[PDB]
């Protein structure tokens, strides 16, 4: 007679919460969650969808201000445990003397004016600063190119007058980190000519980019001039060999700028884009749906979408059928809408939910984007299935997305009226028209 | 902006005794013994009598914490016998009921 | 038609270390209120028995505290006012249960207590005894 | 004249006879009258009259509605956390069993109510119980404990209770109750000479 | 004679609702209370704080939505969170009454360091039980 | 006819051998990476479905209290242990071995170990005010032919 101890099973904190939420869908008679579930408060059009959601949300910023502007109102802690997100939040800087300290604190504090003027005092009274924190300035500067940061009270537009290029004149010492952050300022702000003059500059100093100077570099050279789509491509070439040449290891933003900046070209870039893809695949760098987007876009074009841009969508849709994504781009949500574009113009209903059907699996409805991308997938996703299914299946489609997913536009509303007039299913007619109102 | 000055004064005397309470403790509990030698308790009675007089924790007083009212205050509630009525015949104190058996 | 294709599931790490094991859980919810009660005894029972933990039911006396007051603002000290707050209770006792499905049905039914009743759950954690006393070190 | 809004008919009539209510309320929510599709009332009636409608009654708007706790959400609910139990021991079959195996009971307290702050005093009591017999002991090691323990020990249930709340935290109050079960222990099976005065 | 908390009969005219019209020793009788809360249970703490926030926000939500308010709150309890349950007339637009929602629970929560939610009713009128 | 990611590649960047295995993460994080975190937190941001996921999202925030409820979560006396509350004798030490400052030391110490609303620091510092007291005292005791240290 012998007793066992079973192993202690752990989980996150909020498992479960998530193991419950795993056993309620979508109530499809209910308007989103974010609305209150009251007939004369639940919102009747996109457009007052949309209001709604902007008039609470300014709501939220009122009290935010209120809060930031009265701290002295709110500093009475009685939560256990501390709740720090619900404490005002400060924004005045402690180190008020001249030192490397007050310039990181104020730097960490995005003060843009503050930061520039400790930077001042300190070169005038020449106290000590350090290579890192004067990158760390010039990273403030250059990634918002001096322009102040907006709060809720208180092109090229890289300014030609800039104090950030002014630093860089006065800084003694420079480093990678330092001609790095200034091109990947001058790229973001379009200063296309000035990034590259000091790229050669960096090159001239015997300097290693970073990957995402690479990048900053790739997107200044394809917008820089306006050439033929080979000499964009020998270039960029040019310096992904650079990239070899200095051992540095591309990323995924790499490729994605490279196709985000050829999608230009369209045809010219389209077998191109395709070696570029495989050369991620053997890489190792697995794509995301950025990368899938941005290739989308490139074949995109009017003309024939069955020459070549069926089979791009075909691949891309059998490549990622039953995988569940992950944040890796900044551009991942759109992804979905192009997709849901591209079913739609090409009539392919089996695509279009083949689509639905990988943007339900797992967390992958998370990407479906702003609300105008939602509203505009989901109208092209219901104009397809109106135009392309059994009228039965079309109904029963018409009642889980709306009012639940989205909210109708009338040009639907008049797809699935002629639908249901080729079905001589008339008797929904009025329900429809009440629906309508 | 308390409902009166007598509210404010117990304000007042309520942090001067939180601000002292620590040395309050200290310096009777170096009185309130057998153990040490006379002369010293008789320098801790000096002591604690030069410190002031509202750091004196007898001084403070349970005024109802809405209308300041001294005296039918409810430890439970710190409301007055009149304010608490008025809220529990509104049924905005939970649980509470009119006592009948 | 719009069902999600695929589930997605929260994870569950099955630690090397051995679980606590409860030989008694007695969760005493009290209330103002004995359908409330009634009600979450219900929820708790069918969620103890869907779980497959054993739990047993029991209603402690119930506790009426009363006190007074002057009724009238000023003077006519021979009329009053009594107000009651009644306190009623409901005891759970769970047996035999392991520390990880203690928890999960603790969470549970925490969670989804109803406002206005609270809840003080006795733990008995068996234990056994430490080296130091299994043999004397004398 | 600007328009006036018209509210819209409630949602209730969009639902279905056989749908899946759990969806309509997955978390305690307070009743809604436009979600709820059924006709309730509440109320003391007037004379000769009816319960008030389910539209704008406070009184149903107060009650701690269960509704989203239906038997089938239940059900559902357990279904889904069945993952995260793990079996009892099905060896000890009883408590008989339970003590002849584990012989410290630990007994602990935790106080949920409604309130911003969590913390409770009484929370950091731990009460450890332990039966004599289960011990390794002997006579004399017995009978100086029990002279030590004082009241702790109750002979008709041969059961030692040592009860730690000095410590803020019930971890310290457990770690104290093993500490002070352990050096009572070791001075039980420690023999002074000045014990031959007895 | 009693006066505490009761409509006293004038015309025959005068509206009321449930709660206004029932008397106090109907309380836990035919009306319940407008706040849950376990701080007034035995052994339970923190009643006087919990009946002070109460107090506020009731004042506080009174004031904010003048005359939108077409009867008390209910004020629920459950852990920490706070949820505030409302009857509002139909007399503002919706952006005004989400502007207010977002502002009350962003400053509520912000104020009192726990998660409060707001729960609107939309009634056309004052919902009149009987008429004094 | 062909699959798109089998072809005719780039061949710049040839098969890995080995990927980077001693990872940079020890250097200081920049603001480029700072919004590059906030722009892959934005690409998930979505209005949250249902009830349950605004109960996730507070319980993550940290404005939703965990379960099972734990009255002491978020809260440790800075690690102390049962012995450091307790036994306050090895404070003692800057204290006369016998006499009576020792026995009134001893029932002040027995009193501070009962007590389970005062931190070890707050513990420590009624000790370390009594022997300031009582060395400013010295005179008045040794008066009273009672030796402080």
């Given at each position: ?294 290739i989308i876009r490139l074949f995109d074009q009017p003309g024939d979408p069955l020459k070549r841009s069926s089979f791009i969508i075909y691949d891309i849709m059998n490549e990622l059928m039953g995988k569940r994504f992950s944040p890796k781009d900044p551009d991942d ?105 | ?101 | ?138 | ?80 956390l069945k993952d995260f139990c793990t079996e009892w021991p099905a060896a000890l079959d009883s408590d008989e069993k339970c003590e ?99 | ?132 | ?149």
């Amino acid at each position: 007679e012998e007793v066992v101890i079973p192993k202690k099973k752990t989980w996150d904190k909020v498992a479960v919460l998530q193991a419950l939420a795993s056993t309620v869908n979508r109530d499809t008679t209910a308007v989103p969650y974010v609305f209150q579930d009251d007939p004369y408060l639940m919102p009747a059009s996109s457009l007052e969808s949309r209001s709604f959601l902007l008039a609470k949300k300014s709501g939220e910023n009122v009290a935010k201000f209120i809060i930031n502007s009265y701290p002295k109102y709110f500093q009475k802690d009685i939560a256990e445990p501390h709740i720090p997100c619900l404490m005002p939040e400060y924004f005045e800087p402690q180190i008020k003397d001249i030192s490397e300290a007050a310039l990181k604190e104020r730097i960490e504090l995005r003060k843009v004016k503050a930061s520039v003027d400790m930077f001042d005092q300190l070169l005038q009274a020449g106290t000590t600063v350090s290579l890192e924190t004067t990158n760390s300035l010039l990273d403030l500067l250059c990634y918002y190119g001096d322009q102040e940061p907006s709060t809720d009270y208180h092109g090229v537009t890289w300014r030609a007058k800039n104090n950030a290029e002014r630093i860089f004149s006065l800084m003694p010492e420079k480093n990678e980190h330092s001609y790095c952050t200034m091109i990947r300022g001058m790229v973001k702000h379009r200063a296309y000519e000035q990034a590259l003059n000091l790229y050669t500059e960096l090159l001239n100093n015997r300097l290693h980019a970073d990957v995402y100077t690479f990048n900053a570099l790739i997107e200044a050279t394809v917008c820089a001039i306006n050439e033929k789509f080979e000499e964009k491509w020998s270039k960029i070439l040019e310096l992904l060999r650079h990239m070899v040449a200095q051992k540095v290891k591309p990323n995924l933003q790499t490729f994605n700028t490279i196709l985000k900046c050829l999608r230009r070209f369209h045809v010219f870039a389209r077998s191109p884009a395709l070696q570029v893809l495989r050369e991620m695949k053997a890489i190792g760098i697995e794509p995301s749906l950025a990368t899938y987007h941005h290739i989308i876009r490139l074949f995109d074009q009017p003309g024939d979408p069955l020459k070549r841009s069926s089979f791009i969508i075909y691949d891309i849709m059998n490549e990622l059928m039953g995988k569940r994504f992950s944040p890796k781009d900044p551009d991942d949500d759109k992804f979905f809408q192009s997709a849901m574009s591209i079913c739609s113009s090409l009539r392919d209903l089996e695509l279009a939910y083949q689509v639905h059907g990988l943007l339900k699996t797992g967390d992958n409805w998370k990407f479906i984007g702003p609300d105008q991308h939602r509203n505009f997938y989901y109208s092209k996703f219901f104009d397809l299935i109106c135009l392309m299914e059994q009228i039965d299946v079309t109904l029963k489609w018409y009642e889980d997305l709306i009012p639940s997913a989205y909210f109708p536009h009338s040009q639907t509303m008049i797809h699935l009226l002629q639908a249901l007039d080729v079905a001589n299913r008339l008797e929904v007619i009025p329900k429809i028209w009440k629906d309508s109102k | 902006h308390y409902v009166d000055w007598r509210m404010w004064r117990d304000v007042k005397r309520r942090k001067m005794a939180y601000e002292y309470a620590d040395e309050r403790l200290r310096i009777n509990s170096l009185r309130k013994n057998t153990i040490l030698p006379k002369i010293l308790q008789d320098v801790a009675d000096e002591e604690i009598a030069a410190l002031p007089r509202d750091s004196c924790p007898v001084r403070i007083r349970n005024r109802c914490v809405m209308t300041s009212r001294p005296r039918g205050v409810k430890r439970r509630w710190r409301l007055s016998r009149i304010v608490f009525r008025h809220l529990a015949d509104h049924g905005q104190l939970s649980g509470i009921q009119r006592a009948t058996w | 038609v719009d069902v999600p294709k695929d589930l997605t599931k929260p994870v569950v790490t099955i630690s090397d270390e051995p679980d606590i094991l409860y030989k008694r859980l007695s969760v005493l919810v009290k209330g103002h209120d004995k359908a409330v009660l009634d009600s979450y005894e219900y929820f708790a029972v069918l969620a103890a028995k869907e779980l497959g933990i054993s739990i047993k039911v029991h209603e402690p006396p119930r506790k009426i505290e009363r006190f007074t007051l002057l009724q009238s603002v000023h003077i006519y000290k021979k009329h009053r006012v009594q107000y009651e707050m009644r306190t009623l209770y409901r005891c759970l006792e769970l047996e035999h249960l392991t520390g990880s499905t203690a928890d999960v049905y603790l969470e549970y039914i925490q969670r989804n207590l109803p406002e206005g009743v609270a809840m003080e759950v006795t733990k008995t954690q068996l234990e056994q005894l430490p080296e130091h006393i299994k043999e004397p070190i004398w | 004249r600007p328009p006036r809004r018209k509210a819209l008919p409630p949602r209730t009539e969009k639902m279905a006879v056989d749908q899946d209510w759990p969806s309509v309320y997955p978390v305690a929510a307070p009743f809604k009258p436009s979600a709820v599709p059924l006709p309730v009332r509440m109320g003391y009636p007037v004379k000769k009259g009816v319960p008030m409608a389910k539209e704008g009654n406070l009184e149903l708007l107060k009650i701690p509605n269960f509704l989203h706790l239906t038997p089938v959400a239940i059900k559902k609910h357990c279904e889904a956390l069945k993952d995260f139990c793990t079996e009892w021991p099905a060896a000890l079959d009883s408590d008989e069993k339970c003590e002849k195996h584990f012989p410290i009971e630990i007994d602990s307290t935790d106080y949920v109510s409604s309130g911003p702050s969590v913390r409770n005093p009484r929370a950091r009591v731990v009460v450890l119980r332990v039966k004599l017999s289960s011990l390794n002991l002997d006579d004399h090691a017995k009978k100086k404990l029990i002279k030590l323990v004082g009241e702790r020990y109750c002979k008709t249930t041969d059961v030692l209770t040592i009860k730690t709340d000095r410590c803020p935290l019930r971890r310290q109050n457990y770690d104290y109750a093993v500490y002070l079960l352990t050096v009572l222990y070791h001075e039980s099976w420690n023999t002074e000479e000045w014990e031959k005065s007895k | 004679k009693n006066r505490a908390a009761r409509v006293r009969v004038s015309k025959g005219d005068k509206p009321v609702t449930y709660e206004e019209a029932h008397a106090p020793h109907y309380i836990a009788h035919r009306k319940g209370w407008l706040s849950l809360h376990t701080g007034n249970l035995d052994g339970e703490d923190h009643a006087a704080e919990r009946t002070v926030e109460d107090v506020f926000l009731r004042k506080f939500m009174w004031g904010t939505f003048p005359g939108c308010l077409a009867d008390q709150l209910v004020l629920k309890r459950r852990g920490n969170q706070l949820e505030i349950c409302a009857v509002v007339l139909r007399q503002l637009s919706p952006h005004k009454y989400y502007f207010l929602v977002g502002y009350s629970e962003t400053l509520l929560s912000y104020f009192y360091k726990c998660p409060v939610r707001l729960h609107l009713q939309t009634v056309p009128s004052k919902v009149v039980y009987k008429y004094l | 006819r062909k699959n798109i990611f089998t072809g005719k590649r780039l061949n710049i960047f040839d098969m890995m051998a080995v990927t980077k295995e001693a990872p940079e993460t020890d250097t200081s994080p920049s603001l480029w990476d700072v919004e590059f975190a906030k722009q892959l937190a934005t690409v998930n941001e979505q209005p949250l479905q249902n009830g349950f996921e605004e109960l996730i999202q507070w319980t993550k925030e940290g404005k939703l209290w965990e379960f099972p409820i734990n009255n002491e979560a978020g809260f440790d006396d800075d690690g102390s242990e049962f012995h450091e509350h307790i036994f306050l004798e090895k404070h003692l030490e800057s204290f006369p071995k016998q006499g009576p400052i020792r026995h009134f030391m001893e029932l002040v110490t027995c009193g501070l170990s009962k007590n389970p609303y005062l931190s070890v620091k707050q513990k420590v510092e009624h000790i370390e005010w009594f022997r300031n007291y009582f060395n400013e005292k010295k005179d008045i005791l040794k008066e009273s032919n009672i030796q402080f240290n």
